[PDB]
Short mmCIF file of C-alpha atoms and ligand atoms in Angstrom, two decimals:
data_model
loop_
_atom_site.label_atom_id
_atom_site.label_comp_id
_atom_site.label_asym_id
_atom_site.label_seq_id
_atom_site.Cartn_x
_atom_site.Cartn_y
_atom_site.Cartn_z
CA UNK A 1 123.56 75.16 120.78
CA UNK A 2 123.83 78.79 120.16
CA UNK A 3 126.59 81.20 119.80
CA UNK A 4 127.64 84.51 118.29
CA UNK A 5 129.61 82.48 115.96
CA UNK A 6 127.48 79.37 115.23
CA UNK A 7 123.44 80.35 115.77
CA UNK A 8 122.40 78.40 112.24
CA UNK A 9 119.24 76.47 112.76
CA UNK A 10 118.19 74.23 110.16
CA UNK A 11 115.54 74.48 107.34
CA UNK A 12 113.62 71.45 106.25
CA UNK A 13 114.98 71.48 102.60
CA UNK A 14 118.31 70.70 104.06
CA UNK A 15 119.59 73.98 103.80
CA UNK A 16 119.97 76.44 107.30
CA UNK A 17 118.94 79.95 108.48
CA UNK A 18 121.06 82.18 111.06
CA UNK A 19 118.81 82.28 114.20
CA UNK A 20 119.44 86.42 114.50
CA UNK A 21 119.09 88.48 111.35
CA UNK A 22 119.00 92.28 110.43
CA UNK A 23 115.69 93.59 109.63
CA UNK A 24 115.58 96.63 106.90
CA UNK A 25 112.32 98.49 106.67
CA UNK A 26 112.55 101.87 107.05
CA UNK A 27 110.03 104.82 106.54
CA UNK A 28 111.68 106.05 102.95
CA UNK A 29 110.50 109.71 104.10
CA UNK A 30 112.14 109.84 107.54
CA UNK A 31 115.12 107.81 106.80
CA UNK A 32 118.75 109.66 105.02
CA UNK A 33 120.02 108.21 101.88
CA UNK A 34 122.73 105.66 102.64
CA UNK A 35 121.68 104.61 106.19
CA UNK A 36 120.70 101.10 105.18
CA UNK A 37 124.18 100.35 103.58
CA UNK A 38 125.93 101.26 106.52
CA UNK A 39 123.70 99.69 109.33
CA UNK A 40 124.06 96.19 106.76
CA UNK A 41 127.96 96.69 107.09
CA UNK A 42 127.79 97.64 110.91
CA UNK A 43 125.44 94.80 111.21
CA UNK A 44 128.07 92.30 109.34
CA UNK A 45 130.91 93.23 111.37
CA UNK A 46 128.88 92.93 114.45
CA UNK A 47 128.37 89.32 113.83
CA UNK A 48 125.15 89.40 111.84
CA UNK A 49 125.10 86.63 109.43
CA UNK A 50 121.16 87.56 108.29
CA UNK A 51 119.80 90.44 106.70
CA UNK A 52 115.94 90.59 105.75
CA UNK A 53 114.34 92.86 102.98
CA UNK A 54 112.53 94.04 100.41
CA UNK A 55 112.34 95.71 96.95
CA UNK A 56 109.44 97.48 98.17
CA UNK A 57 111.71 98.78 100.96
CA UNK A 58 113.30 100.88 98.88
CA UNK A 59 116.57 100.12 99.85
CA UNK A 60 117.22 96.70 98.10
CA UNK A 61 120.13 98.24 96.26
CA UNK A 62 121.97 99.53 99.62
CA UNK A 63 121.29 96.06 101.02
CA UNK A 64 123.35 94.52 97.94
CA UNK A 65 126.18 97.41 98.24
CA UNK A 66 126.34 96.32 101.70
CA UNK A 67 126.78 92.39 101.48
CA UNK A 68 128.67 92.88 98.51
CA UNK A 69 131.27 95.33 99.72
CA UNK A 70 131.81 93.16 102.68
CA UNK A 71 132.29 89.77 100.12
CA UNK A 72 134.63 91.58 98.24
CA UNK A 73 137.22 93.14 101.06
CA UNK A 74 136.74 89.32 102.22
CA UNK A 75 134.64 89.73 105.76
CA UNK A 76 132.39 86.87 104.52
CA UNK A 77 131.85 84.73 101.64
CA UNK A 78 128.60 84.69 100.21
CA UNK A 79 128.17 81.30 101.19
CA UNK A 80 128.06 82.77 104.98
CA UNK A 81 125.51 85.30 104.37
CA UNK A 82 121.83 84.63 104.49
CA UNK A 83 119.54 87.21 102.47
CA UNK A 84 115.59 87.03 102.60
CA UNK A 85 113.32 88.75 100.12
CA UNK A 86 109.68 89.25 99.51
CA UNK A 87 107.19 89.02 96.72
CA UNK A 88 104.73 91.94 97.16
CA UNK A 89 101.00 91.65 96.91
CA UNK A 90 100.97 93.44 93.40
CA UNK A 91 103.29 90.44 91.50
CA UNK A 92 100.99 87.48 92.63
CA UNK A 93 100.29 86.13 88.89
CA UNK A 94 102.37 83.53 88.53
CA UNK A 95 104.18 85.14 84.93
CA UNK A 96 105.29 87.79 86.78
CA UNK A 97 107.10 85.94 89.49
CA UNK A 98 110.27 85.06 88.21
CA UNK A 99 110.91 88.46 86.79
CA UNK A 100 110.02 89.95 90.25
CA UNK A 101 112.91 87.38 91.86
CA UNK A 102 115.22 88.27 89.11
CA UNK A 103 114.43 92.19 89.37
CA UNK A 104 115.69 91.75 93.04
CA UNK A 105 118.58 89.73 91.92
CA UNK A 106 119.55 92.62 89.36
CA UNK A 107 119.21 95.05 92.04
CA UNK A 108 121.14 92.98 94.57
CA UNK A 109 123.60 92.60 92.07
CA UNK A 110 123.72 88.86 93.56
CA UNK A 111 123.44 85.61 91.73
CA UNK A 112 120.68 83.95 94.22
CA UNK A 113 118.92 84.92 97.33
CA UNK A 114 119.01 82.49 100.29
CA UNK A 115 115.02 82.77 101.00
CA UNK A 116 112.48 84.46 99.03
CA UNK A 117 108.98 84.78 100.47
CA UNK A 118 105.31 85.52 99.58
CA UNK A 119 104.88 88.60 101.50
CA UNK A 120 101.12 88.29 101.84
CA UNK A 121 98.62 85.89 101.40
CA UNK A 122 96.56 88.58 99.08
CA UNK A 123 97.11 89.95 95.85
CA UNK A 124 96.50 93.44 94.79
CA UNK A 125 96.19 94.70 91.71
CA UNK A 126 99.36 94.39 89.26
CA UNK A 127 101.16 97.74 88.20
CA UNK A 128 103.33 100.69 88.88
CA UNK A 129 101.54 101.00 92.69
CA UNK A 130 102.19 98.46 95.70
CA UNK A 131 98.89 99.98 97.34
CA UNK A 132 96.29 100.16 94.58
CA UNK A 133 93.47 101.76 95.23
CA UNK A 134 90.57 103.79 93.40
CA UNK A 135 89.15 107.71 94.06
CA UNK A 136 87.03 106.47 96.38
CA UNK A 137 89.99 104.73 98.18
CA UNK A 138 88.75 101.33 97.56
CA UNK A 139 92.12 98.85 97.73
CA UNK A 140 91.84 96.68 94.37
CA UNK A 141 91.80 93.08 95.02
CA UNK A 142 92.92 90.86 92.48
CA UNK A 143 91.34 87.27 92.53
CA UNK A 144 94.35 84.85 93.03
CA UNK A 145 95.51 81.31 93.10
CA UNK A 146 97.81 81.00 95.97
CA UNK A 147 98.93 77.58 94.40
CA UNK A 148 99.63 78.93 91.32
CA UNK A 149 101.79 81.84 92.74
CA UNK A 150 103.66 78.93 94.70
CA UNK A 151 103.83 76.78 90.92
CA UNK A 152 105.88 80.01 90.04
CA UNK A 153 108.19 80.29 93.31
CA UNK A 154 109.13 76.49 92.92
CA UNK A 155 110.44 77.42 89.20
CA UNK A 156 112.09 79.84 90.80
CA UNK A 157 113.80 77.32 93.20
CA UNK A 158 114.22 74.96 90.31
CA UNK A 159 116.38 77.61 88.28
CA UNK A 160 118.58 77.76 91.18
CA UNK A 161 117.52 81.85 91.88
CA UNK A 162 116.99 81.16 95.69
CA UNK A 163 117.92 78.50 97.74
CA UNK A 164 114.48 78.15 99.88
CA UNK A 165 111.28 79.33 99.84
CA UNK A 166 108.84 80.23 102.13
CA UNK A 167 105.73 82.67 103.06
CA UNK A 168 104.60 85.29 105.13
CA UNK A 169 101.52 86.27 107.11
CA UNK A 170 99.96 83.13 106.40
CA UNK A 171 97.24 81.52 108.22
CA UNK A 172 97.11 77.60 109.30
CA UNK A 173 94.44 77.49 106.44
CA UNK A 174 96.66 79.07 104.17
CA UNK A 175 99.38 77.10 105.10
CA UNK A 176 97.31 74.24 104.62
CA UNK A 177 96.24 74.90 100.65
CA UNK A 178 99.88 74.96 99.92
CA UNK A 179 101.18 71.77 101.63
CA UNK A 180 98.27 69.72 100.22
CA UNK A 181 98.97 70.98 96.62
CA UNK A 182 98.68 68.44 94.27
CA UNK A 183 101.78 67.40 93.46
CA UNK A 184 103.63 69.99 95.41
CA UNK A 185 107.65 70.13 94.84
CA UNK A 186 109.01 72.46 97.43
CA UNK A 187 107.05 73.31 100.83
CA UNK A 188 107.06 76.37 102.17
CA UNK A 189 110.43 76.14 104.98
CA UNK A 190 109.59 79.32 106.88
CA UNK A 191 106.49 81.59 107.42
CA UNK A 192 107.34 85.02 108.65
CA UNK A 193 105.03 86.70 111.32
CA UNK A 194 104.50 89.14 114.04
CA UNK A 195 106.00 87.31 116.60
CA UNK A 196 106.98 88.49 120.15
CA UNK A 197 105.81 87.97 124.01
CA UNK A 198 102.48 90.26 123.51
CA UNK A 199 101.51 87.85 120.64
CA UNK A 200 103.55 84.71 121.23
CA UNK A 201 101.80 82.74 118.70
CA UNK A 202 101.04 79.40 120.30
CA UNK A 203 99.05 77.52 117.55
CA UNK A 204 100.60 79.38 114.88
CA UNK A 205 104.22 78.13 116.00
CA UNK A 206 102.92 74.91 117.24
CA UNK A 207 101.46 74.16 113.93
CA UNK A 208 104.51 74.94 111.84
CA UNK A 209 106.54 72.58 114.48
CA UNK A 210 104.60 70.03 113.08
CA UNK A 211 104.91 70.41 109.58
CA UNK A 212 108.78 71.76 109.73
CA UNK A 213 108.16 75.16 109.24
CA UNK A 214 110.40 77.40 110.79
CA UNK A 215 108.69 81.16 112.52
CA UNK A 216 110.53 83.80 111.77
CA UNK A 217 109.57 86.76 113.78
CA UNK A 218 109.10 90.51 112.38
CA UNK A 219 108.71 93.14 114.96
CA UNK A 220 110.08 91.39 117.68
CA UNK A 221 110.80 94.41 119.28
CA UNK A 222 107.23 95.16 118.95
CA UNK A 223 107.58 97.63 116.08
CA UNK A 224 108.83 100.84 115.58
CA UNK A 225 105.22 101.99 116.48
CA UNK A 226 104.19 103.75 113.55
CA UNK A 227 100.33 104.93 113.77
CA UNK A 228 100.40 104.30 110.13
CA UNK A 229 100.64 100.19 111.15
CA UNK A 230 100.27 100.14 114.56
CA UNK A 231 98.10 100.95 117.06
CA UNK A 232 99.70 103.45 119.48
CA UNK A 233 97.42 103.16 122.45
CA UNK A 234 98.37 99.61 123.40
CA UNK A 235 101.55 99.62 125.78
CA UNK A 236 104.70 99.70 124.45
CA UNK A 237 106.41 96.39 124.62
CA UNK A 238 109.59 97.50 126.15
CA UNK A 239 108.39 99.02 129.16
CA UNK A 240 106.70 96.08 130.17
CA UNK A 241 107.44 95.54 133.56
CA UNK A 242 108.72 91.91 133.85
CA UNK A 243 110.69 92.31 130.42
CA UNK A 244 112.52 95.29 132.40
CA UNK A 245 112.46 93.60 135.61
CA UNK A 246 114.51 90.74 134.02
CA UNK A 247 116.60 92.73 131.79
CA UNK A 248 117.59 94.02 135.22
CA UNK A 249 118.79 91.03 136.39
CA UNK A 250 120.89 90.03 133.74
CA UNK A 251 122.04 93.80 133.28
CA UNK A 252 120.45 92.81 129.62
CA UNK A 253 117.70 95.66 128.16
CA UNK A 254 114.08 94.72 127.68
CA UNK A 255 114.95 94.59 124.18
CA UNK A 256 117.65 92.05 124.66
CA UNK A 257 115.29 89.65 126.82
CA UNK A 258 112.72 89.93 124.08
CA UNK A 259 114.70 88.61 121.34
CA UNK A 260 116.18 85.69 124.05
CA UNK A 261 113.50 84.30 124.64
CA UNK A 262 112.40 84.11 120.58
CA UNK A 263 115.79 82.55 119.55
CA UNK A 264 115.79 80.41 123.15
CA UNK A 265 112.87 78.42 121.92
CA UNK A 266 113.55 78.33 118.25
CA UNK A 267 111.81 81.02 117.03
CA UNK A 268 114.20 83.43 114.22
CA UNK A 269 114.10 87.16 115.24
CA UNK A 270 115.01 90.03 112.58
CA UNK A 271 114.85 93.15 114.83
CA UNK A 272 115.86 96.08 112.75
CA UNK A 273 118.03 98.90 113.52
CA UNK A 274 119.87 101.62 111.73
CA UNK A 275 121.63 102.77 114.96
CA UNK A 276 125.15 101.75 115.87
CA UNK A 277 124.41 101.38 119.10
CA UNK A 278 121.42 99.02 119.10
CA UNK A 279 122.41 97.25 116.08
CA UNK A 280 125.05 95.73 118.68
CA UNK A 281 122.79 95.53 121.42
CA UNK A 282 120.75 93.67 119.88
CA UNK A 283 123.26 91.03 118.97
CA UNK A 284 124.57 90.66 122.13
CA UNK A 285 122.40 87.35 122.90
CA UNK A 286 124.02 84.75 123.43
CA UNK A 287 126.02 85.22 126.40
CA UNK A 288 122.58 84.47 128.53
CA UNK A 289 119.79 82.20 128.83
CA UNK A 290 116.37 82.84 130.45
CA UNK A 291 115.63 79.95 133.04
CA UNK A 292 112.28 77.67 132.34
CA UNK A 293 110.39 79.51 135.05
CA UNK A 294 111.61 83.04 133.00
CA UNK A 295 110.31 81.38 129.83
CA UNK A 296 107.35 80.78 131.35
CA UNK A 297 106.70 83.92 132.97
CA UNK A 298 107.38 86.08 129.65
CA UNK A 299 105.09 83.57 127.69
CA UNK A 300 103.28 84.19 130.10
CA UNK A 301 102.57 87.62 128.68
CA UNK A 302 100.84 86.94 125.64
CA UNK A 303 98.02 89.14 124.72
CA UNK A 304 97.02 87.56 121.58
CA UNK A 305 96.83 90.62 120.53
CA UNK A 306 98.49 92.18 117.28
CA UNK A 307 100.51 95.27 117.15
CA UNK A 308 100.18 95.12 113.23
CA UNK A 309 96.63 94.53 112.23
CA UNK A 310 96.48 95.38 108.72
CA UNK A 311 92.86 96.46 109.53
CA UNK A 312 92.72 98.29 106.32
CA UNK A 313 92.75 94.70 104.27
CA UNK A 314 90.39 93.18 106.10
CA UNK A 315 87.39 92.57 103.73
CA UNK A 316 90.02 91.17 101.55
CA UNK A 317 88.86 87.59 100.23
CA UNK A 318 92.62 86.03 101.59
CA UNK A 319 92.84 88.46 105.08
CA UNK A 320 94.87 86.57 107.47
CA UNK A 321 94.26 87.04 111.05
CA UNK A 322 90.18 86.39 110.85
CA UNK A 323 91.17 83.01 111.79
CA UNK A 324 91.87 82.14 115.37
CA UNK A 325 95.58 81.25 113.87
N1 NAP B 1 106.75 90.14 106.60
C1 NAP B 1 106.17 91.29 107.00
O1 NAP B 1 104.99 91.52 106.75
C2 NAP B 1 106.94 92.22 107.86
C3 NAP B 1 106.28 93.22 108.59
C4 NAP B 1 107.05 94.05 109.41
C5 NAP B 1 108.42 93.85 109.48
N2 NAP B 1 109.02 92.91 108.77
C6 NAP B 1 110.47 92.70 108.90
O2 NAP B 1 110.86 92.55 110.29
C7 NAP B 1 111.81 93.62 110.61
C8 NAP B 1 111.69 94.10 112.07
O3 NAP B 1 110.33 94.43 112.39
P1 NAP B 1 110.12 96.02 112.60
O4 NAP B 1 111.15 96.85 111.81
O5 NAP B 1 108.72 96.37 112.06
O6 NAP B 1 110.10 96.50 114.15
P2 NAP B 1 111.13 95.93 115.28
O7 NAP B 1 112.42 95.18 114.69
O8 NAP B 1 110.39 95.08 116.24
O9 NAP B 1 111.61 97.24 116.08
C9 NAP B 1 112.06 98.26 115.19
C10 NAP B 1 112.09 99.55 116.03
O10 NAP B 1 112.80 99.32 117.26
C11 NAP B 1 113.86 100.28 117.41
N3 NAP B 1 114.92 99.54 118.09
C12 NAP B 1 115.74 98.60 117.53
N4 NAP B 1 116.50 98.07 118.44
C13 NAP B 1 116.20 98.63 119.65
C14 NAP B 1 116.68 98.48 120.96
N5 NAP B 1 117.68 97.57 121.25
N6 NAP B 1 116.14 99.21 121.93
C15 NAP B 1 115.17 100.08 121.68
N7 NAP B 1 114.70 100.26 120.46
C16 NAP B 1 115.18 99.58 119.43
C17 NAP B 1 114.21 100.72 115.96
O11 NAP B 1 114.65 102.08 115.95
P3 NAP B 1 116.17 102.25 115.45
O12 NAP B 1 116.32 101.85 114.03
O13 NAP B 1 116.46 103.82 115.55
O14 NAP B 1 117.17 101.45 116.42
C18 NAP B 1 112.80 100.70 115.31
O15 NAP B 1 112.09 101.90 115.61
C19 NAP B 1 111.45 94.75 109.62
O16 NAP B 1 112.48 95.73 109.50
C20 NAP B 1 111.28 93.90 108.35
O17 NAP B 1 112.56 93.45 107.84
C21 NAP B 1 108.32 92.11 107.98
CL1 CL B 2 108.08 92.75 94.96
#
């Protein structure tokens, strides 16, 4: 089913996703110039076939250097690579999506992207700022069309700029307004979420079963717990007990039973790394399964509780996680 060489599942627009990916966010203050390149080419001779980003990363170019670097000496053909990207917040009027994509494509230096994403279900307000705000601190909320912004996406599709499309930190509601658009084209294959045995995501993930919607999940390590995002009282997710008590038994880390049990029932996992070290840890998946009664027990540790709240957009008119999923 799943192996370091062949862990593709498939996407409902007949096109496929490798089940492991690299994720690339990194704190632009506390991370050296040149450290996403490299853990991209560490990460493709490793075995990774998956890299997720971001222009608002920061480091879309060192992404492209990466992948492209690795084309051209002939470690992969782009046809074996699998990039996501992300529309921000800021670029949700649907003129401004296609020369978003295509900004991402310049900086790439790459003719298409395999996935491209709303990143949120809210826009901000359009400009030189991702996190517009007034003096007061007030975060500007632009009134949007989520259909609309999709309209623009599907273009996107249609130009042949990404393969699939998808969304991210969308609710079933959300969801919902976009699948029942009149006269929809393209449905949204993947919605990308905290996902991750604190927050397991049962209705979420059984919903998206239903409609062929693949999970992918961010911070399936449980974050790099950042106060900034997260909420650095809860416990850590890799000292859990059973997590280490397992890892144990398989001579696997916590971190390595984690992302198991994602990829073990479907879910995509895109822990990120910069470190040589873990970037092959991480990887090293596939050479173990958890037993039903281990499934169980880790899903059994759901907290449904969220290590990334986004508390600070929580008035906003399209806030995601009011809903119970
Ligand atoms: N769509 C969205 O809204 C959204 C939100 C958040 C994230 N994402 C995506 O999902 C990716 C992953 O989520 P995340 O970066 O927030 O957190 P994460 O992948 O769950 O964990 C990242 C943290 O874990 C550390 N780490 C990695 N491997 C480890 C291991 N084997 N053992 C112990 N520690 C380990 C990393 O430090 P080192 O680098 O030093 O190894 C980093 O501090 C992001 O990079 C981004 O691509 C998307
Ligand atoms: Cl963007």
């Amino acid at each position: 089913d799943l192996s370091a060489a062949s862990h593709r599942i498939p996407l409902s627009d007949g096109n496929s996703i490798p089940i492991i990916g690299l994720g690339t966010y990194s704190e632009p203050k506390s991370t050296p110039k040149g450290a996403c390149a490299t853990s991209v080419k560490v990460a493709i001779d490793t075995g990774y076939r998956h890299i997720d980003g971001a222009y608002i990363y920061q480091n879309e170019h060192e992404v492209g250097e990466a992948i492209r670097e690795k084309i051209a000496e002939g470690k992969v053909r782009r046809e074996d690579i699998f990039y996501c990207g992300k529309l921000w917040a800021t670029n949700h009027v649907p003129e401004m999506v296609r020369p978003t994509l295509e900004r991402t494509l310049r900086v790439l230096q790459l003719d298409y992207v395999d996935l491209y994403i709303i990143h949120v279900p809210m826009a901000f307000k359009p400009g030189d700022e991702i996190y517009p705000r007034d003096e007061n601190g007030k975060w500007l909320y632009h009134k949007s069309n989520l259909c609309a912004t999709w309209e623009a996406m599907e273009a996107c599709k249609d130009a042949g700029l990404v393969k699939s499309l998808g969304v991210s930190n969308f609710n079933r509601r959300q969801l919902e307004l976009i699948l029942n658009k009149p006269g929809l084209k393209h449905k949204p294959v993947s919605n990308q979420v905290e996902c991750h045995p604190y927050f397991t995501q049962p209705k979420l993930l059984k919903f998206c079963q239903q409609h062929d919607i693949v999970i992918t999940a961010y911070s399936p390590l449980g974050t790099s717990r950042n106060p900034i995002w997260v909420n650095v009282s809860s416990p850590p997710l890799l000292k859990d007990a059973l997590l280490n008590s397992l890892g144990k038994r398989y001579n696997k880390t916590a971190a390595q039973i984690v992302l198991r049990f994602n990829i073990q029932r479907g879910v995509v996992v895109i822990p990120k790394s910069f470190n040589l070290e873990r970037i092959k840890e991480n990887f090293q998946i596939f050479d173990f399964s958890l037993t039903e009664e281990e499934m169980k027990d880790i899903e059994a540790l759901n907290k449904n509780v969220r290590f990334v709240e986004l508390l600070m957009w929580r008035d906003h008119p399209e806030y995601p996680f009011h809903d119970e999923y």
